[PDB]
Amino acid sequence: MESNLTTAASVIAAALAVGIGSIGPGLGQGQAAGQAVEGIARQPEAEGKIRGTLLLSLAFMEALTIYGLVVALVLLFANPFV
Amino acid sequence: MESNLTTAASVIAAALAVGIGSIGPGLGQGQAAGQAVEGIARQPEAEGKIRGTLLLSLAFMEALTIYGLVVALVLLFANPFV
Amino acid sequence: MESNLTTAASVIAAALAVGIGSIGPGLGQGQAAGQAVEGIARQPEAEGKIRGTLLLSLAFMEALTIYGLVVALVLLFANPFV
Amino acid sequence: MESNLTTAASVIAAALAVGIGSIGPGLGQGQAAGQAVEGIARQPEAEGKIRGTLLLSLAFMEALTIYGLVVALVLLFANPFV
Amino acid sequence: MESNLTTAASVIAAALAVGIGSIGPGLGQGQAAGQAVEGIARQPEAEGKIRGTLLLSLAFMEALTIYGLVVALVLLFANPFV
Amino acid sequence: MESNLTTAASVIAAALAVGIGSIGPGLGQGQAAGQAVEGIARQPEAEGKIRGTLLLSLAFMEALTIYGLVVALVLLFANPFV
Amino acid sequence: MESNLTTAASVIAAALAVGIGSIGPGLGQGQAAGQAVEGIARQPEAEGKIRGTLLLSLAFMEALTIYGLVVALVLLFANPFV
Amino acid sequence: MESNLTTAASVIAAALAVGIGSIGPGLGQGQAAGQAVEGIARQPEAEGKIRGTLLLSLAFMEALTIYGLVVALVLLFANPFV
Amino acid sequence: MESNLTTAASVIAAALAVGIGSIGPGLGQGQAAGQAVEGIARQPEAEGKIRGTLLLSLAFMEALTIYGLVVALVLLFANPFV
Amino acid sequence: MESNLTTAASVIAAALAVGIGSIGPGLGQGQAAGQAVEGIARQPEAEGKIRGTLLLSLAFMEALTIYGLVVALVLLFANPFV
Amino acid sequence: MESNLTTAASVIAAALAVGIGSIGPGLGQGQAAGQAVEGIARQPEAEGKIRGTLLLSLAFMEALTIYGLVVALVLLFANPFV
Amino acid sequence: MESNLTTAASVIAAALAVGIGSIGPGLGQGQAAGQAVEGIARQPEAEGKIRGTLLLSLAFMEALTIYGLVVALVLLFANPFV
Amino acid sequence: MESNLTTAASVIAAALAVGIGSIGPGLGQGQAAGQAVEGIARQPEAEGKIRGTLLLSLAFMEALTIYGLVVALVLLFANPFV
Amino acid sequence: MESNLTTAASVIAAALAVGIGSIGPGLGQGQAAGQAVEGIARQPEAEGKIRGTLLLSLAFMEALTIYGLVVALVLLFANPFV
Amino acid sequence: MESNLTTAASVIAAALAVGIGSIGPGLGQGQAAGQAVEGIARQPEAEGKIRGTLLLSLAFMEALTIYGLVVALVLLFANPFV
Numbered sequence A, B, C, D, E, F, G, H, I, J, K, L, M, N, O: 001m002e003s004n005l006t007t008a009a010s011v012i013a014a015a016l017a018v019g020i021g022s023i024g025p026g027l028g029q030g031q032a033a034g035q036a037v038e039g040i041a042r043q044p045e046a047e048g049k050i051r052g053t054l055l056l057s058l059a060f061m062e063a064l065t066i067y068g069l070v071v072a073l074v075l076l077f078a079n080p081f082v
Ligand SMILES: OC[C@H]1O[C@H](O[C@H]2[C@H](O)[C@@H](O)[C@H](OCCCCC3CCCCC3)O[C@@H]2CO)[C@H](O)[C@@H](O)[C@@H]1O
Pocket: A004, A005, A008, A009, A010, A012, B005, L008
């Protein structure tokens, strides 16, 4: 067991990296997906192209939150200090 | 049984990870699902394609919050410090 | 029976988990449901398709706040520390 | 009878759980219901279908705040610590 | 006459439960009632339908704040601690 | 005369219950009333129906702020602690 | 003649009750009155009906702020504690 | 002549009462006045009806900030405590 | 000459009264005036009627900030305490 | 050279009066001038009218910030306390 | 050299007067200028009138920030206290 | 194992770099991808062009957050101080 | 070589003056330049007039931030106190 | 190796520089790129011209965040103080 | 080598200067660039005029953040105090 300023800061930090880090990407994925299904309603023949482009986009955005995830995980499972 | 700065920080961190972590994805899911059912009303024949793309989208967004859940669960059931 | 920093933090944390965890999902659910009933007004024949997709959607959003609920419940009934 | 940091925290937490927990669902219920009554005016024949889907939606949103309520209730009537 | 941390926290908690707990429902009620009244102007013949769906909706929203009011009332007239 | 943490917290609490508690309902009543008079301009023959529905709505919203009022008044005229 | 925590809190509480208490209702009154004069321009024959409904609305909104006034006046002229 | 916590709080309170008390009403007055002059451009013949209703409105909004002014004035010229 | 907590508070209060007190009225005056000059362009024959109604409006909004000014002036030139 | 709580509060107060006091009027002036210039483009013949009403409006708004400037200048060159 | 509460407050105050004081006027100048060039695109023959009116407007808005500037400069080059 | 002010500041810093650093890019990516997918629906033939411009854009935005990630990674695996 | 409250305040003040001071003018410049290039697309013949007016506007806005720069530079290179 | 107030500050500063520094540019890059791909769909023949102008824009915005990056880098690799 | 309040403040200040200094300009650049590429889609023949005006614009906005950069650089490489 260990408790000090740095272990305390690490668990808070871990929460903030993934917590805050999902805000922009979460909204952004919704905006993109929303336009995707709207576009499919408009032009069902473009479904494949639309899906392909969305998927790509979803990946970029999800990688943003994943950066927060790796920081969180480094802090919890590979902490350099504590 | 155990109380210090780091246990106190862990329980707060746990709540913040899942609480904050649900904000962007919750809004994003509503936006996407909203455009999806609008699109279905507009072009009921496209419902399978729209549902497929939405479902894909919903999963990517839910995953953002699940990262938060994971951090919360590690802090609660596999805490590295306390 | 027991009071320290960690019991105090735990009860605050439990409330922030569910309380904050309902903001994005509640707003999202409203956005999606509203587009659903609007969609039904526009095309009452698509009512079954619209309803099925809405329901799917509402479940994904409900799960986001449930993650908060779960963290709140372990904190209250299976606290790892106090 | 008893006052310490946890009883004080428990009462504030209970309030935060239900108070904050009503913000998203309250806005969302209004957005849905306004769209529902707009739909009815637009297509009074779909009223039953609209009302049915709205009811389903409202219950989902109400459940979100109910999660807050139960945390508040546990804190006040089944408090694990104090 | 007793004053301690918990009695002070309790009166504050009481105000926060009902004060904050009215923001979402109050806004939501406005939105819904506004759409309803506009709907009546558009289609006076659907007034009974519109008015019924509104009433149902208002009640769901008022319940959200009432949960706050229950917490306030427990904290004031059935306080578990003080 | 009496001054302690709890009398101080009570007068602040009283102010916050009615102060904050008027924000949502005040905006909401404006939104609803605004659509009402707009609807009357559009369809002056629906004036009675519109007024009836508004009035009902205004009552629900005003009851939300009134909950804050009763808490304030319990705190000032029927305080359980001080 | 008299200064302590509770007198200081009372004077602040008084200002906050009326100051905050005017925000939602002030905005709401502007919104409603604005739609009212727009409606009059649109249908000058409906001016009596529009004025009647507005006046009713203005009263309900003013009452929200008056609750704030009342709390302020009790704190200043009928203080229960100091 | 006299300085303590309560004189200090009283002057701050007086300023917050009028200062904050002008935000909602000032914005509201602008919204209503702007719709009024727009209305007059659309239907100059309704100018008298529009003006009368505006004036009524402006008075209700002005009264909201006046409540703030009144609390400020008693605090300055009829302080109950200091 | 004199410095204590109340002189310090008085100067800050005076600034807050006029500074905060200009925000709503400043925005509102702009909203009204922009609508006024838009109306004039639309119907230059109504200019006198528009200008007249605008003037009335502007004075009402200016009075709101003037209430702040007078509190500031009392605090600086007729201070009851210091 | 004197430094005390009040001299420090005074220089800060001075900045807040004119700094905060420019937000509403600055935004408002922009809104009004933008509408004016757009109006001129729409109806170049009404330029004299539009320009006169604008000038009048600008002066009312600049006065709001000037009140802030008066407070600043008193606090700096005619300080009542220090 | 001199360092005390008041020199420290003066340099911060100076920054806040011009820093905050550019926010409203900066936005407002953009809004106005934007409508000006839009109006010129619409009616290039009105270019002279539009420019004349913009210029006037820009001056009023720029004077608002200049008030913050003179306070800053009084504080740095003509400080009444330090 | 070392804990000091700097190790604590470093883990927090790491979370802030990637957490905050994802807000703008995440929102921006959503906006861009949404427009792209809508564009494809409008003109399926331009899909290759649209998709290429999007990909280029996504990369510029992901780099913004990656800068945050670099700072986080230095702070964690190549800390200059601790 | 020199450290005290006022040197620390000066360096912070310097950053805040230019940092905050760029917010309104940066947004305003984007708004104006945006309408300018839209206007050019709309009426390419007006490009000289639009460019002239924009350039004038850009200068006035840049000047707002430069006031911030000036305060920062005085604090850094001509500090009156330290 | 070394921990003091400046090393702690340096690491937080580095994070704030790149984290905050990505917010505006990230939003702006998204706004530009979305408009770019919308333009391409509208006029696929202009793609090269659109892509060229977008590239120029993206580099300008990226440079803004790069300024943050370099401050962060100096703080971490060329720190003048620690 | 050296740590005190002023080195600490200086590094924080340097980061706030560039970090905050990029928000308005980054958003502004996005607004202008987006209107530019939209303009090019509408009128590809005006591409050169549009690009030239955009470029001019981007430079004015870039300079705003550069002022921040400059304050950051003197603070780091030509600190007047430490
Ligand atoms: O000054 C050095 C000493 O500091 C420690 O105690 C200090 C230390 O600042 C910290 O535990 C405590 O402050 C803790 C408040 C910070 C809470 C949280 C931390 C990270 C996430 C954000 C905020 O205060 C103690 C007393 O002032 C420990 O007593 C000891 O290990 C160490 O040597």
